[PDB]
Amino acid sequence: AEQFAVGEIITDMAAAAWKVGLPIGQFGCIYLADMNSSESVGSDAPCVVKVEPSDNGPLFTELKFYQRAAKPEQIQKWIRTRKLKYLGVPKYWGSGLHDKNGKSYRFMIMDRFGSDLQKIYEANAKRFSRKTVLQLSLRILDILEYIHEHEYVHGDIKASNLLLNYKNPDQVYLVDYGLAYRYCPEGVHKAYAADPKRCHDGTIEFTSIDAHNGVAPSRRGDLEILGYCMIQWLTGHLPWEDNLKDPKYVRDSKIRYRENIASLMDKCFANAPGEIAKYMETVKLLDYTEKPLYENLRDILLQGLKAIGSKDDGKLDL
């Protein structure tokens, strides 16, 4: 199905006009997009349009997240109060309803990014430096604190969901909120239980123990997912990576390694970077409904940067 005629002008719900260009990268139904003008949408376009049938659940979930939490000025306000260089939550530009060939579709206009981190990781023989991992993780902690404080949990952090700013290789953004989860609607935390609405478990190698136990994701699970990403990034591996077809094996391993983090460090690393063990110990202390002390997690990571004779200079080193 072609959802658009290439070069057509589409008008969103706020009457802003956009033009549609070609598909990106040979992701889903995602096309380059720009402000309506007399020029064609070029390969250096600054936006994308994501389009799915209107009965698609994930696009609707994602749209709601972006409308509630990613409004250009909502993000800018947070950046000013927190004295952040930037925030890696993509900006929402608009959305609408588009009918074609008697089918109804939903569309959403978003920032356009450069490469995902997974491609860059594979081009570096599946390693990121200690400097890179700490700098990424600091910015992901900023992002997670933001979304959590706006009642959502991502539940699927991974290098393929981390995109670089098209104009700035040192700024990383977390994308894909189609299976994001509003753990705290109206300040009321979800109970330790399954959500019948939700069916997703994250990505098996990175997902949280809570997710493996069949309960809805919460804040600690996001921090836990980031922990496993860090190890994967530093080492090229996770202990359970050859048994991903067997979830109960993966859960058993995660549960045992949480109970004994020094054995995780022994398995994954001779000498391990101490911030990682410290990070995971702090995450382990969290109850299901407990608010993380994000600034203490960031501190733990800053002490890793000090230990390699560096600082938080915002350099990803990719």
Swiss-Prot record:
Consequence of substituting T81A: Does not abolish autophosphorylation
Outcome of mutating T289A: Does not abolish autophosphorylation
EC code(s) of this entry: 2.7.11.1
Entry's Gene Ontology molecular function annotations: ATP binding; histone binding; histone H2AX kinase activity; histone H3S10 kinase activity; histone H3T3 kinase activity; kinase activity; nucleosomal DNA binding; protein kinase activity
Record's protein name: Serine/threonine-protein kinase VRK1
Tissue: Widely expressed. Highly expressed in fetal liver, testis and thymus.
Variant or mutagenesis effect after changing R112C: In PCH1A; likely pathogenic; severely reduced kinase activity resulting in severely decreased autophosphorylation and phosphorylation of COIL, H3, H2AX, TP53, JUN and TP53BP1; reduced protein stability
Outcome when changing S137A: Does not abolish autophosphorylation
Catalytic reaction annotation: L-seryl-[protein] + ATP = O-phospho-L-seryl-[protein] + ADP + H(+); L-threonyl-[protein] + ATP = O-phospho-L-threonyl-[protein] + ADP + H(+)
Subcellular location: Nucleus; Cytoplasm; Nucleus, Cajal body
Record has ATP-binding as a keyword: yes
Catalytic residues, chain numbering: D156
Coiled-coil blocks: none
PTM comment, free text: Autophosphorylated at various serine and threonine residues. Autophosphorylation does not impair its ability to phosphorylate p53/TP53. Phosphorylation by PLK3 leads to induction of Golgi fragmentation during mitosis.
Any GO CC annotation of this UniProt entry: nucleus
Clinical note on disease: Pontocerebellar hypoplasia 1A: A form of pontocerebellar hypoplasia, a disorder characterized by structural defects of the pons and cerebellum, evident upon brain imaging. PCH1A is an autosomal recessive form characterized by an abnormally small cerebellum and brainstem, central and peripheral motor dysfunction from birth, gliosis and spinal cord anterior horn cells degeneration resembling infantile spinal muscular atrophy. Additional features include muscle hypotonia, congenital contractures and respiratory insufficiency that is evident at birth.
Effect annotated for changing R68Q: In HMNR10; uncertain significance; increased kinase activity resulting in increased autophosphorylation and phosphorylation of COIL, H3, H2AX, TP53, JUN and TP53BP1; does not affect protein stability
Family: Belongs to the protein kinase superfamily. CK1 Ser/Thr protein kinase family. VRK subfamily.
GO biological process, one term: neuron projection development
Enzyme class, broadest EC rank: transferase
Gene: VRK1
Effect of mutating S218A: Does not abolish autophosphorylation
Covalent crosslink: Glycyl lysine isopeptide (Lys-Gly) (interchain with G-Cter in SUMO2): K50
Domain Protein kinase, first and last residues per copy: 18-294
Binding site for ATP: I24, G25, Q26, F27, G28, C29, I30, K50
Keyword set includes Magnesium: no
Consequence the record notes for mutating L174V: In HMNR10; uncertain significance; increased kinase activity resulting in increased autophosphorylation and phosphorylation of COIL, H3, H2AX, TP53, JUN and TP53BP1; reduced protein stability
